[PDB]
Amino acid sequence: YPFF
Amino acid sequence: DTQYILPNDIGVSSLDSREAFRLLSPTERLYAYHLSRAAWYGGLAVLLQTSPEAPYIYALLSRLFRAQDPDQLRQHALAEGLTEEEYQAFLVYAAGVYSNMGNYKSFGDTKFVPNLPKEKLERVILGSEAAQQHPEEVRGLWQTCGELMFSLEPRLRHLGLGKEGITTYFSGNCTMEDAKLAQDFLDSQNLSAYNTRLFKEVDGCGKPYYEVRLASVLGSEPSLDSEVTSKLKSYEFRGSPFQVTRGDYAPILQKVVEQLEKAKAYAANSHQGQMLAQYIESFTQGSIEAHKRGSRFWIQDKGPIVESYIGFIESYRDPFGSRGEFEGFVAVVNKAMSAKFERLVASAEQLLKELPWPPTFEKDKFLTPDFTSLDVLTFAGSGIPAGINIPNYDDLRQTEGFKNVSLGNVLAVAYATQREKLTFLEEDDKDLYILWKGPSFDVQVGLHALLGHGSGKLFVQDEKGAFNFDQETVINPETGEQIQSWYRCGETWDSKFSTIASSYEECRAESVGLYLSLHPQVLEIFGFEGADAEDVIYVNWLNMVRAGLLALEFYTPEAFNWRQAHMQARFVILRVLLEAGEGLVTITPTTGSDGRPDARVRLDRSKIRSVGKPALERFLRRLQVLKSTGDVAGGRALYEGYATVTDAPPESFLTLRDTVLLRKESRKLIVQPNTRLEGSDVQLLEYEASAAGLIRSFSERFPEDGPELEEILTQLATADARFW
Ligand SMILES: [K+]
Ligand SMILES: [Mg+2]
Ligand SMILES: [Mg+2]
Ligand SMILES: [Zn+2]
């Protein structure tokens, strides 16, 4: 779960 | 500012990795070198995971720029009648394909085409040095991908299932109905979808047959593994024929494991050594269980100097939301910046109790996770994030542990603060925005990953229905009744919530970010303390409601579909805060100084704690409850409710969207460095922050087997050509  | 094209003056920035690289020992540099090679190699598979024509386009571009660099090709292109502006458009397009590993934006899932006449580009390509050396290879590629390079037919404009969308996770004839049917089959066979694709071929009688192809080096031939090969057979699922195959991206993944093996010889410890062995096992056989074992080992490798993770990790671009896109990163730990995040971990267990749900919906044991700040040397795939929470295996997240990562040298690029570019803000807010845009992000990212993605208990049942919780005691705080719904064996977060899974979870994490940003203790960890601490709070909230408005760019009215998980999530938060009323947040359609339609976002700083907090706390609790119980029905009813985009008064979002698009700004392209093995040392190659510089970075990316990779991608695409 990344963050853009 | 035109849809489906990249502007000529699009921003390009170079990743700053020089200082981090200088600190690495010779052994660490060789370690990072091979891992980078493995990442870049696997990153090519994203081309196959994007569009049918994408592998051809890359092969054509790679052939073109190997024979003639951007300056050499310029002299040819301009001599063929192209203006400098038209040649620039081609360079920008090529850099776009490179930076996205496809002709679709990684952020927004929209197609982009070259901003120049097709017949003009044809003269350049067919008259190029690459064409003179290999006329068959080049004319064949242009004949194949040429029309699709420029075509903006409505069904090609966006990624997705059905006939009005493009996807290569599925065959072209697949729909959401098919994808749902496949997921049930996968769940029943306890088979992960992360490294799989789905193909539907009808027979002579029109009867469909389903192929679930796993990604692996090995094909149908006998191997040493039995965990996967026992699954390589035909099935009968609900009258539908299913066949589990493998060997997807086989020669590409072969290149990957070659470099993982070499990197394994420079591992700092047994954790790194064994995790790489399992990754090799995973990419060779096609076992996610093997990748799980690797991930389990990876978590145990705490505070490494060279951090890395690779595989089919994130499931954003899968229109069903379960299949993973390949990625791989190699980064250097920034001890200095990693200090503030470890201070947050030190008080993380305490802060979890501040979250708006009882410990019955919180993880049993708090596992002290690893949160580091990293300087990226390599991030292969469709795009680069700001911060990550990994692994995505929930069974590991609440039993083994998980790592948190903030990409500090990526955050610096995103801090491109220009007064003109700050749209939909009053003059009073612009100054406050630039002052605290950076600091607020670090705070938001910190809470988004650690306390956001890292919080939440999942209710499960095993092959014999016993629970990881206590049904007789645990009570649903929204209904008052005992737990009715849960996750069964084989079910994952992505399998149940599917299409909204990514956006939902991202929204939950973002809400936790805003919520716990009100906590003065957290403001200390990042150290703002006073008026500054009140300032970073306002900006963080101001940015959110602004992002919620900007998010309308990534919504498709004709399909009633959101295209980007994070932006959809931020629109939801805006709708929630708008729902609270009391003049907390308002949107006002105005007229810009340029004489074009504009808008303004008004956020009352005073009603953030009085109106905002009770709004989020209520919303955040409903999120976690439906998530923990796997209440997909309630989850969708809740989330898709706020996610609804209508032209209803007083906001008129559908009208606002036209204004958002009109004044939208294109996301920057990021150039990444390379590593070479000159003699016995590793050197770092850096490039110009431009379209040409980005192109050059890929021209030198594969110096040993460049032409081979082009042939591999070409033949892999040709093999699946019947699917689309
Ligand atoms: K997903
Ligand atoms: Mg489709
Ligand atoms: Mg990208
Ligand atoms: Zn995230």
Numbering used by the authors:
A (entry chain B): 1 to 4
B (entry chain A): 3 to 726
Task: Please quote the authors directly.
Human dipeptidyl peptidase III (hDPP III), also known as enkephalinase B, is a member of the M49 family of zinc dependent metallopeptidases and cleaves dipeptides sequentially from the N-terminus of various bioactive peptide substrates. Crystal structures have so far been determined for DPP III from humans as well as from Saccharomyces cerevisiae. Despite the low sequence identity (36%) shared by the two proteins, both structures are very similar and consist of two lobes separated by a wide cleft. The “upper” lobe is mostly α-helical and contains the zinc binding site as well as the catalytically important residues.
Proline containing peptides are more resistant to cleavage by peptidases, however hDPP III has been shown to act as a post-proline peptidase and to bind endomorphins with micromolar affinity. Again, the N-terminus is bound by polar interactions with the conserved residues Asp-316, Asn-391 and Asn-394. Due to the proline at position 2, however, endomorphin-2 cannot form the canonical antiparallel β-strand interaction and the otherwise conserved interaction with Tyr-318 is missing.
